[PDB]
Amino acid sequence: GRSIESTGFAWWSGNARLINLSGKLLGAHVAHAGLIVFWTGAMTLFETSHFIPEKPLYEQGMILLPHLATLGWGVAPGGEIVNTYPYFATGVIHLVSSAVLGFGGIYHSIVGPDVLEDSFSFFGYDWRDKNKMTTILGIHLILLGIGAFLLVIKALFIGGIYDTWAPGGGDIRFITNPTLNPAIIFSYLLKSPFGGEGWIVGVNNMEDVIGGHIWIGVTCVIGGIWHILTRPFSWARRAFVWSGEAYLSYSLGALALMGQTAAEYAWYNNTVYPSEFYGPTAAEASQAQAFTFLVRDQRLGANIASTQGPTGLGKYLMRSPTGEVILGGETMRFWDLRAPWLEPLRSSNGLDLNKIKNDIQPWQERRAAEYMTHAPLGSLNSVGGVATEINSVNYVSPRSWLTTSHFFLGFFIFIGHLWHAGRARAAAAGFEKGINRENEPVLSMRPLD
Amino acid sequence: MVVQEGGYLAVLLGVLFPVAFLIILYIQSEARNAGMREAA
């Protein structure tokens, strides 16, 4: 059915006509995946085409290339993009694959059978068939586990991954000893999301990252096998709504949560998101300004550890509420920052005043200048700087684009979750099309007062 | 805090003069209501 009369849905809600049509639904999914891979390839080739050799990635509006560079392709020590060819390779691969997935999509959408339950029995399904659904879920879970293990393999054996914390500046490194200790990994899991903690966003070394992916790989594989070879318990069968729209709503809630988490990763983390590629964080840039003028004024003959600001607090150096020696001014809020250009100057009780007085390196000053001058602030039309800044610098940090876009997405996806969950309940119970004029519940209820 | 004293009066007078007004109406309203509901 492809009409209002035959389905009950209008041309807008047109896509709901595919709920019980396994074939065309599969076609829609495959075609959509085709669109995703299409965009990946095309945009990657776009970024490779527009890239300029002697400029940082974050100055050129790149979001895909920083991922590949993070994985360790075409990168020299320090975050210099030398070889831009593997990017071209991945882009091409994705594009062509997009041709394949596109063909399959159009086929199953228009050419093939509408119902896969007739001609087939393995690819056919009833939404109300719990076992089949848990089977598919298990399969795809195993796939995800395999992907996690792909990252693990890539980082352990094939070249390695770009480590910004590498002893000698940022450089690609093969992770020899990943973290398998449950105390640590799951210490990430059960930790507060607030300041100084950061939950899972507070991961600052590739050992813990890759080890975490080992754990998540094992977990996904074992869970996949678990769901393939078992059936849902009684309590789950009683607690859940078993229909397509309900499953859609669940995945929507999940993806909303994930969207928010990703936005936070892009905004605060600088390990999985190297500042060499993605640019500095807000925290990093503010701290970079404080550092910069600390250095400038110290060079002008000021004892910064004794310099009293207008408020009475340290102008350049003060204490955090828990005692640590931190940079002064507003950036006191950002004292949880950890950056490879600053940690050399870090001691047990925070910033080491002696190292600040004596051992500050030129490259550190360059880092601070660069980062404070490339802070993630900019307009919608990519005018770099604060809102009052004039038109000269064409710049908006990749972190801003990623975080904002994924907040947008996560948000609307949550809205969709509410919508489809509600409609799932109403359709399951049987009143999603209105109140029964002959069975109005309220009329069968005792009045409130 | 140096405030304008008249305020006190203003506020209270303001607040209390309609309040009373309302209450008066309401109660007599209800009285009449009752009567009419009773003889029906």
Partner: peptide, 30 residues
């Protein structure tokens, strides 16, 4: 001590709300 007057007015409003909720005249179906 205008604070007394402010507190009085706020308490007044909240009381009005309370009685508006738990002392409303019940709606009656036709």
């Amino acid at each position: 001590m205008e604070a007394l007057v402010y507190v009085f007015l706020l308490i007044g409003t909240l009381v009005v709300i309370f009685f508006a909720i738990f002392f409303r005249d019940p709606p009656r179906i036709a």
